[PDB]
Write a protein that binds this DNA or RNA. Structure first.
Ligand SMILES: NC(=O)c1ccc[n+]([C@@H]2O[C@H](COP(=O)([O-])OP(=O)([O-])OC[C@H]3O[C@@H](n4cnc5c(N)[nH+]cnc54)[C@H](O)[C@@H]3O)[C@@H](O)[C@H]2O)c1
Ligand SMILES: NC(=O)c1ccc[n+]([C@@H]2O[C@H](COP(=O)([O-])OP(=O)([O-])OC[C@H]3O[C@@H](n4cnc5c(N)[nH+]cnc54)[C@H](O)[C@@H]3O)[C@@H](O)[C@H]2O)c1
Lengths: 217, 217
DNA sequence: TAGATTGTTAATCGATTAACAATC
DNA sequence: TAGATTGTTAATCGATTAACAATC
């Protein structure tokens, strides 16, 4: 359980995103008026959400883009730095390993790990792939903050444990399993496996209620 | 805006997943009682959610795993078939293209597209990479249901449009951009670029309110 | 200044939980 | 059958919206 309501927290990187578009375009200031306009949210929510972390607004003025942006940056914690590792140098593994946008925002890939020894030594974007046996130790030596999980779901909770045990601070989970972690570990589930299904679901939904509303009268 | 509340819809793939674990272990039946136990949700919510699509339950008995599972299948619309294409044969592109579990559940890769001709013809898991010029057409000839977007964000709304125009039914969106689609197009955003930030945010949150609760008294 | 727009509290809306009568 | 567990309605909780007095 976190201090701010999660519904809100999930909307923060979104503000961060739009605010930076405005900053990038030399727009000097914006009002929640115009922002909710632009983001298709309610002007209340915006003022509402923001006023969990204080007033960045100025009556009569609106919000100074540069100053609010720079503040969301600090709120999302992106003024700091995060050492990350990837477990599972697979397809997804490597695609995530190659992607560098994350770096810009503070997240530095320190290591990649796999069981399959063919891969040991292999270098992706200049981080070498290492035996996942040594992970528990490497985490401890290198103050690893986030572990990115891209190994097959099978018996993976075991590996998740070894991570937690070794003092990993949060896990980013790409497997289609709900993992079990301690209270002091942030688990972020992705679950494409699911997200996709809400699409197949939405596509069929409208016809699925002729299938069920043709069941009473 | 959809018939069932979204909050619910997003939990459906989750039930589906659990139910299938049970089915896999020959467990003949389960009660919302034991399920909310196993899933760490409230027994009401389960019964609650499910009774949007009818009573698969039996008083005194609970839920027949097999029959409930098979019904979630039908609800999530995983009893039909979906033609999918991928735009952008990059890292993520190919990673998603190579992943075959999606097929098992109804989703069939019919094509992959790129602008860079250096890829044209190249075959991934036996679909060959084609010029994204031809996509508008290929969508129409092959009744493509979902387009998976894995192109760089820059100017992508243009490409998005082309897809919509050609009558794609939904887009699965992996770019860190909010796209604009018509009412009759299902847009599913992924936004790893965000989800990750809720982790850096959570890591710094507890200290961020010492930084702000040391600001009044 | 005075018109504009925020911080913030109050009213509404939706989603979760709890309760219980119906029933297998 | 009778103990168990659902379908469903009612009570609670949380999140979104609306409103307005404070203030730049
Ligand atoms: N790839 C996708 O498009 C996609 C979509 C949804 C979910 N996933 C999940 O992503 C994870 C991997 O998918 P992928 O990268 O396409 O599969 P992959 O390419 O087979 O990756 C598996 C990698 O993990 C390695 N490995 C296996 N076990 C371990 C272990 N215990 N410790 C360290 N390394 C290990 C294995 O050698 C291989 O390199 C799986 O859990 C999928 O279920 C992937
Ligand atoms: N890879 C990740 O780890 C990751 C994480 C978060 C977001 N993303 C997003 O995923 C998308 C692609 O990432 P990636 O695949 O790693 O980059 P990539 O590996 O450079 O893939 C880009 C591919 O798309 C092709 N392309 C460019 N423009 C077009 C176009 N207009 N139509 C069709 N194809 C085009 C391009 O030639 C290349 O093959 C980008 O939108 C990223 O922002 C990726």
């Amino acid at each position: 359980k976190t201090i701010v309501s999660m519904a809100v927290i999930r909307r923060l990187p979104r503000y961060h995103r739009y605010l930076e578009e405005l900053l990038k375009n030399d727009v000097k200031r914006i009002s929640s008026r115009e922002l909710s306009e632009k983001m298709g949210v309610t002007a209340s929510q915006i003022r509402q959400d923001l006023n969990n972390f204080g007033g960045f607004g100025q009556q009569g003025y609106g919000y100074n883009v540069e100053e609010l942006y720079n503040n969301l940056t600090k709120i999302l914690g992106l003024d700091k730095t995060y050492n990350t590792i990837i477990i599972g140098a697979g397809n997804l593994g490597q695609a995530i390993a190659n992607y560098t946008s994350f770096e810009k925002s503070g997240f530095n890939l320190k290591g990649i790990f796999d069981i399959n020894p063919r891969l040991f030594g292999l270098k992706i974007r200049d981080v070498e792939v290492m035996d996942v046996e040594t992970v528990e130790d490497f985490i401890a030596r290198n103050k690893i903050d986030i572990g990115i999980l891209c190994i097959p779901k099978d018996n993976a909770q075991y590996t998740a444990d070894r991570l937690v045990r070794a003092g990993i601070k949060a896990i980013w989970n790409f497997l289609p399993i709900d993992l079990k972690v301690p209270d002091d570990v942030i688990l972020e589930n992705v679950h494409l496996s699911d997200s996709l299904f809400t699409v197949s679901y939405r596509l069929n939904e409208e016809e699925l209620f002729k299938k069920l509303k043709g069941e009473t009268a």
